[PDB]
Amino acid sequence: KITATPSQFQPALLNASKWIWTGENPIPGGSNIISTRPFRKNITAPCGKCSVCATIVVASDDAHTFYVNGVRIGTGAGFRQGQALFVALQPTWNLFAIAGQNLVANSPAGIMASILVHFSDGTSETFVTDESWKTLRAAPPENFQLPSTNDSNWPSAAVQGAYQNSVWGPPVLPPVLPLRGSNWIWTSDNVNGAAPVGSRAFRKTVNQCTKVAVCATVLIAADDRYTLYVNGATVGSGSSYTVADAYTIPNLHPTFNTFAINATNGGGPAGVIATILITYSDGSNETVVTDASWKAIQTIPQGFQPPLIDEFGWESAKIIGAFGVAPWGAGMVIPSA
Numbered sequence: 574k575i576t577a578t579p580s581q582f583q584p585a586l587l588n589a590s591k592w593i594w595t596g597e598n599p600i601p602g603g604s605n606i607i608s609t610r611p612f613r614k615n616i617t618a619p620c621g622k623c624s625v626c627a628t629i630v631v632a633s634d635d636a637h638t639f640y641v642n643g644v645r646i647g648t649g650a651g652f653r654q655g656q657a658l659f660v661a662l663q664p665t666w667n668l669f670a671i672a673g674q675n676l677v678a679n680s681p682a683g684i685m686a687s688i689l690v691h692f693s694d695g696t697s698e699t700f701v702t703d704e705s706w707k708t709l710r711a712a713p714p715e716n717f718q719l720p721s722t723n724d725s726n727w728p729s730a731a732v733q734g735a736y737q738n739s740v741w742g743p744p745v746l747p748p749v750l751p752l753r754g755s756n757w758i759w760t761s762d763n764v765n766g767a768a769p770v771g772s773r774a775f776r777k778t779v780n781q782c783t784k785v786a787v788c789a790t791v792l793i794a795a796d797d798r799y800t801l802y803v804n805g806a807t808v809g810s811g812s813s814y815t816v817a818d819a820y821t822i823p824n825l826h827p828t829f830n831t832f833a834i835n836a837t838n839g840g841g842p843a844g845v846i847a848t849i850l851i852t853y854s855d856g857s858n859e860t861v862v863t864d865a866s867w868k869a870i871q872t873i874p875q876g877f878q879p880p881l882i883d884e885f886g887w888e889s890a891k892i893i894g895a896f897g898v899a900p901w902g903a904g905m906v907i908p909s910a
C-alpha cells in the first residue's frame with residue numbers, strides 16, 4: 574500500500590559506498606589479472622515497509638553488467654563518472670548481482686554502487702557495495718545472477734577503497750536523465766524563433782495494458798515556466814530554461830498514466846522539454862521524450878490535465894529543435910542521479 578506521493582527527485586550518492594573486488598590481490602587498488610568476477614547481495618526491506626523501486630548509481634574499473642532479481646538492468650564501464658539505472662523492486666527482498674570485468678593486465682579492479690530504495694510509505698534508504706557482498710575468485714557460474722543460485726559458501730567481497738580514499742578518486746554522478754534525445758516542443762504558432770505571449774498545454778499518455786508500471790522519474794524545463802501534472806495531480810512547477818527540475822512519481826497507475834504540462838511564454842522564444850523514465854514490475858523500463866507524439870493546444874481548456882478528456886482539436890506538438898539548438902544551447906544544469 575503506497576502512501577508516497579510525487580516529490581522532488583532525491584539523488585543517489587556514492588559518498589557512503591565502497592569499491593569491491595575479490596581480494597585475489599590482498600593489496601586494495603593493487604594489480605589484478607584480466608578476469609570477470611561475480612558479486613551478489615540479497616537486501617531485505619526493514620520491518621513493515623515495502624520496497625517499491627530504486628535509483629542506482631554504479632561505476633566500474635573496467636566494466637559491469639547489473640542484474641536485479643535475475644533481470645539484466647544495464648551494462649556500463651568506467652570509474653570517472655557513474656551510470657544511472659532505475660528499477661522496480663519486489664516488496665520484501667531483492668537480489669542485486671553484478672558481473673565486473675578487469676580488462677587491463679596488472680591494473681586495479683573494482684565495482685562501486687549505491688542503491689537508493691524508495692519504500693511504500695515515502696521513506697528511502699541507501700544500500701552500497703561493501704564487504705557484506707558475496708563474490709567468487711573465479712569466472713561467474715552460469716546463472717550466478719538468479720535468486721535460485723545458493724551463495725551461502727561464496728567468500729566475502731574485499732574492499733578496494735572508499736569514495737574519498739581510493740586509487741580511483743570520487744566518481745562524478747551522471748545526470749538523473751539525459752536531455753540529449755529529447756526535443757523542445759511547442760504549439761505550431763512558434764515560428765521564426767519566437768512564439769506569442771501566453772499559456773499552452775501538452776499531453777502524453779503511456780498505456781502498456783499488458784505490463785505493470787511502478788515509478789516514473791521526470792526531468793523537465795521550460796522557456797519561460799511550466800506546471801506538471803500526472804493523472805490530474807500536481808507534481809510541480811518551474812520557471813527556468815537554464816536549470817531543469819527532476820521529480821519522482823512513486824505511485825503510478827499500473828497500466829495508464831497521463832502527463833500534462835501547462836507551459837507559459839513571457840515573450841520571445843518558447844519551448845518545453847522533458848525526459849520520462851517509467852519502470853515496470855518485470856525489470857524493464859521505457860523512456861518517453863518531448864516529441865511530435867505529444868498533443869498540444871493553444872487555448873487551454875478546463876480539465877486539460879484529467880487523464881481521459883477528449884483530445885479532439887489538440888494538434889501534434891511542433892518540434893522547435895532537438896536538445897542543443899539555439900537559443901537555449903546544451904548547458905542545461907541537470908540534477909545528479
Ligand SMILES: *[C@@H]1O[C@H](CO)[C@@H](O[C@@H]2O[C@H](CO)[C@@H](O)[C@H](O)[C@H]2NC(C)=O)[C@H](O)[C@H]1NC(C)=O
Nearest residue numbers: 645646647648649657658659660856857858859
Ligand atoms: C532500461 O532497460 C534497458 C533494457 O533492459 C537497458 O538497455 C538496453 O540496455 C542496455 C544497457 O545499458 C543499453 O545500453 C542498450 O543500448 C539497450 N539496447 C540497445 C541500444 O540495443 C537500460 O539500461 C535500462 N535503463 C535503466 C534501467 O535505467
Ligand SMILES: *[C@@H]1O[C@H](CO)[C@@H](O[C@@H]2O[C@H](CO)[C@@H](O)[C@H](O)[C@H]2NC(C)=O)[C@H](O)[C@H]1NC(C)=O
Nearest residue numbers: 615616617665666667668719720721722723724
Ligand atoms: C533474501 O532474504 C530473504 C529474507 O531473509 C529470503 O526470504 C525468506 O526466505 C525464507 C527461506 O525461503 C522464506 O521461507 C521466508 O519466508 C522469506 N522471508 C521473507 C521476509 O520474505 C530470500 O529468500 C532471500 N533471497 C535470496 C535470493 O537469497
Ligand SMILES: *[C@@H]1O[C@H](CO)[C@@H](O[C@H]2O[C@H](CO)[C@@H](O)[C@H](O)[C@H]2NC(C)=O)[C@H](O)[C@H]1NC(C)=O
Nearest residue numbers: 772773798799800835836837873874875876877
Ligand atoms: C497556466 O499557467 C499560467 C501560469 O502559471 C496561469 O496563469 C495566470 O493565472 C492567473 C489567472 O488565472 C493569474 O492571476 C496569474 O497571476 C497568472 N500568472 C501568469 C504567470 O500568467 C494559467 O492560468 C494556468 N492555467 C491554465 C489552466 O491556464
Ligand SMILES: CC(=O)N[C@@H]1[C@@H](O)[C@@H](O)[C@@H](CO)O[C@H]1O
Nearest residue numbers: 796797839840841842843900901
Ligand atoms: C522578454 C523576452 O522575450 N525574454 C526571453 C526569454 O523568455 C527567453 O525566451 C530567452 C531565450 O533565449 O529570450 C529572452 O529574450
Ligand SMILES: [Ca+2]
Nearest residue numbers: 634635680681
Ligand atoms: Ca582495470
Ligand SMILES: [Ca+2]
Nearest residue numbers: 796840841842
Ligand atoms: Ca520566452
